[PDB]
Amino acid sequence: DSDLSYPTVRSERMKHKRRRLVQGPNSYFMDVKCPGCNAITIVYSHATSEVQCNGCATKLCRPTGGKAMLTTGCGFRKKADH
Protein backbone atom coordinates (compact mmCIF):
# COMPACT_ATOMS: atom_id res chain seq x y z
CA ASP A 1 0.00 0.00 0.00
CA SER A 2 1.01 3.62 -0.70
CA ASP A 3 2.50 5.77 2.07
CA LEU A 4 3.26 9.47 2.41
CA SER A 5 6.09 8.62 4.84
CA TYR A 6 7.92 6.34 2.39
CA PRO A 7 6.96 7.39 -1.16
CA THR A 8 6.93 5.34 -4.37
CA VAL A 9 9.78 5.43 -6.89
CA ARG A 10 7.72 6.41 -9.95
CA SER A 11 6.09 9.37 -8.19
CA GLU A 12 9.36 11.01 -7.13
CA ARG A 13 10.99 10.71 -10.57
CA MET A 14 8.54 13.39 -11.67
CA LYS A 15 8.73 15.94 -8.89
CA HIS A 16 10.58 19.24 -8.81
CA LYS A 17 13.43 19.68 -6.32
CA ARG A 18 11.38 22.22 -4.36
CA ARG A 19 8.40 19.82 -4.29
CA ARG A 20 10.44 16.80 -3.21
CA LEU A 21 10.32 14.97 0.13
CA VAL A 22 14.02 15.60 0.81
CA GLN A 23 14.47 18.72 -1.34
CA GLY A 24 17.91 17.57 -2.49
CA PRO A 25 19.98 18.88 -5.42
CA ASN A 26 18.96 18.16 -9.01
CA SER A 27 22.48 18.56 -10.43
CA TYR A 28 25.63 16.51 -10.86
CA PHE A 29 29.21 16.92 -12.09
CA MET A 30 31.06 15.52 -15.08
CA ASP A 31 34.65 15.08 -16.16
CA VAL A 32 35.16 16.93 -19.43
CA LYS A 33 38.34 16.01 -21.27
CA CYS A 34 40.25 18.76 -23.05
CA PRO A 35 40.74 17.31 -26.58
CA GLY A 36 43.51 19.85 -27.32
CA CYS A 37 45.76 17.82 -25.02
CA ASN A 38 44.79 15.29 -22.42
CA ALA A 39 43.72 17.29 -19.38
CA ILE A 40 40.91 15.95 -17.23
CA THR A 41 38.95 18.82 -15.71
CA ILE A 42 35.84 18.86 -13.51
CA VAL A 43 32.86 20.75 -14.97
CA TYR A 44 29.38 21.27 -13.54
CA SER A 45 26.18 20.24 -15.33
CA HIS A 46 24.52 23.64 -14.94
CA ALA A 47 27.78 25.54 -15.40
CA THR A 48 26.04 28.82 -16.30
CA SER A 49 29.27 30.41 -17.58
CA GLU A 50 32.23 29.29 -19.70
CA VAL A 51 35.15 27.37 -18.18
CA GLN A 52 38.57 27.15 -19.80
CA CYS A 53 41.78 25.27 -19.22
CA ASN A 54 45.19 26.20 -20.65
CA GLY A 55 45.08 22.99 -22.69
CA CYS A 56 42.01 24.20 -24.60
CA ALA A 57 40.93 27.21 -26.54
CA THR A 58 38.34 24.63 -27.72
CA LYS A 59 36.56 25.64 -24.47
CA LEU A 60 34.63 23.07 -22.45
CA CYS A 61 31.12 24.37 -21.88
CA ARG A 62 28.82 26.96 -23.43
CA PRO A 63 27.27 29.42 -20.93
CA THR A 64 23.66 28.53 -21.80
CA GLY A 65 21.11 28.71 -19.00
CA GLY A 66 19.21 25.44 -19.46
CA LYS A 67 22.25 23.26 -18.77
CA ALA A 68 25.74 23.29 -20.28
CA MET A 69 26.26 22.39 -23.93
CA LEU A 70 29.65 20.78 -23.98
CA THR A 71 32.01 21.14 -26.94
CA THR A 72 31.96 18.34 -29.54
CA GLY A 73 34.89 15.89 -29.59
CA CYS A 74 35.28 15.98 -25.81
CA GLY A 75 35.31 12.91 -23.57
CA PHE A 76 32.47 12.80 -21.05
CA ARG A 77 32.58 10.67 -17.93
CA LYS A 78 29.70 10.91 -15.47
CA LYS A 79 30.56 11.48 -11.83
CA ALA A 80 27.91 10.63 -9.25
CA ASP A 81 25.91 13.25 -7.34
CA HIS A 82 26.88 11.75 -3.99
Binding site: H16, R18, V22, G24, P25, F29, V43, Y44, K79, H82
Partner: protein, 141 residues
Protein backbone atom coordinates in the same frame (compact mmCIF):
# COMPACT_ATOMS: atom_id res chain seq x y z
CA UNK B 1 5.66 37.05 -2.56
CA UNK B 2 7.73 39.59 -4.51
CA UNK B 3 8.58 42.52 -2.21
CA UNK B 4 7.32 45.31 -4.44
CA UNK B 5 4.91 44.76 -7.31
CA UNK B 6 3.43 41.44 -8.44
CA UNK B 7 5.29 38.19 -8.72
CA UNK B 8 5.35 34.65 -7.49
CA UNK B 9 8.32 32.59 -8.59
CA UNK B 10 9.88 29.43 -7.23
CA UNK B 11 13.21 29.86 -9.06
CA UNK B 12 15.77 29.07 -6.44
CA UNK B 13 18.85 27.02 -5.71
CA UNK B 14 18.64 24.14 -3.25
CA UNK B 15 21.40 22.58 -1.16
CA UNK B 16 23.30 19.31 -1.24
CA UNK B 17 21.92 16.72 1.20
CA UNK B 18 25.53 15.69 1.87
CA UNK B 19 27.33 18.36 3.88
CA UNK B 20 30.63 16.43 3.98
CA UNK B 21 33.01 16.89 1.01
CA UNK B 22 32.92 14.58 -2.10
CA UNK B 23 35.40 11.74 -2.69
CA UNK B 24 36.59 13.43 -5.91
CA UNK B 25 37.56 16.55 -3.97
CA UNK B 26 40.85 15.82 -2.28
CA UNK B 27 41.68 19.54 -2.00
CA UNK B 28 42.38 20.94 1.45
CA UNK B 29 40.92 24.00 3.21
CA UNK B 30 44.02 26.08 2.43
CA UNK B 31 43.88 25.64 -1.38
CA UNK B 32 40.21 26.76 -1.36
CA UNK B 33 41.00 29.82 0.83
CA UNK B 34 43.91 30.83 -1.46
CA UNK B 35 41.71 30.55 -4.61
CA UNK B 36 39.03 32.84 -3.06
CA UNK B 37 41.44 35.61 -2.03
CA UNK B 38 43.33 35.39 -5.37
CA UNK B 39 40.12 35.92 -7.39
CA UNK B 40 38.93 38.68 -5.02
CA UNK B 41 41.91 40.92 -5.97
CA UNK B 42 40.34 41.32 -9.44
CA UNK B 43 37.43 43.09 -7.73
CA UNK B 44 35.03 40.14 -8.04
CA UNK B 45 32.10 39.96 -5.61
CA UNK B 46 31.59 36.70 -3.58
CA UNK B 47 28.69 35.71 -5.87
CA UNK B 48 31.04 35.22 -8.83
CA UNK B 49 33.86 33.74 -6.70
CA UNK B 50 31.56 30.84 -5.79
CA UNK B 51 30.61 30.39 -9.46
CA UNK B 52 34.25 30.25 -10.67
CA UNK B 53 35.06 27.76 -7.88
CA UNK B 54 32.06 25.38 -8.33
CA UNK B 55 32.43 25.20 -12.13
CA UNK B 56 36.20 24.77 -12.42
CA UNK B 57 37.19 22.86 -9.31
CA UNK B 58 33.96 20.91 -8.78
CA UNK B 59 33.52 22.47 -5.31
CA UNK B 60 30.22 21.44 -3.72
CA UNK B 61 30.06 24.49 -1.49
CA UNK B 62 32.84 26.68 -0.06
CA UNK B 63 31.27 26.04 3.36
CA UNK B 64 31.54 22.23 2.85
CA UNK B 65 35.29 22.13 2.01
CA UNK B 66 36.41 24.90 4.40
CA UNK B 67 35.02 25.68 7.85
CA UNK B 68 33.67 29.01 6.67
CA UNK B 69 32.05 30.68 3.66
CA UNK B 70 33.24 33.34 1.26
CA UNK B 71 32.85 36.63 3.17
CA UNK B 72 34.33 35.26 6.43
CA UNK B 73 37.47 34.26 4.42
CA UNK B 74 37.79 37.76 2.86
CA UNK B 75 37.13 39.61 6.18
CA UNK B 76 39.83 37.66 8.00
CA UNK B 77 42.39 38.58 5.32
CA UNK B 78 41.18 42.22 5.18
CA UNK B 79 39.97 42.11 1.57
CA UNK B 80 36.25 42.32 2.41
CA UNK B 81 34.10 45.11 0.88
CA UNK B 82 32.60 47.70 3.25
CA UNK B 83 29.46 48.03 1.12
CA UNK B 84 27.34 44.81 1.10
CA UNK B 85 26.71 43.12 -2.29
CA UNK B 86 22.91 43.55 -2.38
CA UNK B 87 23.12 47.27 -1.54
CA UNK B 88 25.82 48.14 -4.10
CA UNK B 89 24.03 46.48 -7.05
CA UNK B 90 20.76 48.37 -6.44
CA UNK B 91 22.67 51.71 -6.27
CA UNK B 92 24.27 50.96 -9.67
CA UNK B 93 20.92 50.11 -11.32
CA UNK B 94 19.43 53.22 -9.61
CA UNK B 95 22.03 55.69 -10.99
CA UNK B 96 21.65 54.16 -14.50
CA UNK B 97 17.85 54.68 -14.40
CA UNK B 98 18.50 58.31 -13.35
CA UNK B 99 20.68 58.75 -16.49
CA UNK B 100 17.90 57.45 -18.74
CA UNK B 101 15.30 59.65 -16.99
CA UNK B 102 17.53 62.76 -17.25
CA UNK B 103 17.20 62.36 -21.02
CA UNK B 104 13.65 60.99 -21.16
CA UNK B 105 11.14 62.68 -18.86
CA UNK B 106 8.26 61.15 -20.83
CA UNK B 107 9.28 57.65 -19.72
CA UNK B 108 6.65 56.41 -17.31
CA UNK B 109 8.02 52.93 -16.53
CA UNK B 110 11.60 53.64 -15.42
CA UNK B 111 10.30 56.48 -13.21
CA UNK B 112 8.10 54.12 -11.16
CA UNK B 113 10.91 51.57 -11.04
CA UNK B 114 13.31 54.18 -9.63
CA UNK B 115 10.74 54.93 -6.85
CA UNK B 116 10.74 51.18 -5.95
CA UNK B 117 14.58 50.83 -6.08
CA UNK B 118 14.95 53.98 -3.87
CA UNK B 119 12.70 52.76 -1.03
CA UNK B 120 14.23 49.24 -1.33
CA UNK B 121 17.76 50.72 -0.85
CA UNK B 122 16.43 52.65 2.18
CA UNK B 123 15.12 49.36 3.72
CA UNK B 124 18.60 47.79 3.26
CA UNK B 125 20.30 50.92 4.75
CA UNK B 126 18.03 50.89 7.85
CA UNK B 127 18.69 47.13 8.29
CA UNK B 128 22.51 47.39 8.14
CA UNK B 129 22.58 50.30 10.62
CA UNK B 130 20.61 48.23 13.16
CA UNK B 131 22.89 45.29 12.48
CA UNK B 132 26.12 47.23 12.24
CA UNK B 133 27.82 46.83 8.89
CA UNK B 134 27.57 50.46 7.74
CA UNK B 135 28.25 53.70 9.66
CA UNK B 136 25.18 55.03 11.52
CA UNK B 137 25.28 58.26 9.48
CA UNK B 138 24.95 56.40 6.14
CA UNK B 139 22.29 57.62 3.73
CA UNK B 140 21.54 56.95 0.04
CA UNK B 141 21.73 60.65 -0.82
Amino acid sequence: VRMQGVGHGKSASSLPFCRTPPSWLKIASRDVIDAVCKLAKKGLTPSRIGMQLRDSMGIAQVKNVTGRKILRILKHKGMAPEIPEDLYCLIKRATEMRKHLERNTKDRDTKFRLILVESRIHRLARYYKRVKQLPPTWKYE
